[PDB]
């Protein structure tokens, strides 16, 4: 439905894959992007 | 699981936010939106 919600779910899946391989730096950096996108999604949806 | 219980909870809170918006009740909207954001965060963390 929401394009940005899909982008968030996509990021979260890339974070999962990085966790599953033990890639800590990639998890950390992607998490920052997830947080920012989520707060854009709140701005859109508020 | 399916995520449906959490999704339903979020839909319910969103209906109360709409009701507060419809009355122009700003503080109620903003406080309920904080609760909505916290559950949305968990929804995203549980997504596949």
Superfamily of domain B1-48: Rabenosyn, Rab binding domain (4.10.860.20)
Instruction: Using alpha carbons, select from B43, B9, B22, B13 the residue that is nearest to residue A34.
Output: B43
Q: Does A34 touch chain B (CB under 8 A)?
A: yes
> Solved by what technique?
X-ray
Tell me the residue length of chain A. Answer: 46
Q: Does A30 touch chain B (CB under 8 A)?
A: no
Superfamily of domain A1-46: Rabenosyn, Rab binding domain (4.10.860.20)
Query: b/e string for B2-33 if b means 16 or more Cβ within 10 A?
Result: eeeeeeeebeebbeebeebeeeeeeeebeebb
Whole-number Å distance between alpha carbons of B1 and A28: 26
């Amino acid at each position: 439905g929401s394009p940005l919600a899909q982008q968030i779910k996509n990021i979260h899946s890339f974070i999962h894959q990085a966790k599953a391989a033990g890639r800590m730096d990639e998890v950390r950096t992607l998490q920052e992007n997830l947080h920012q996108l989520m707060h854009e999604y709140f701005q859109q949806s508020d």
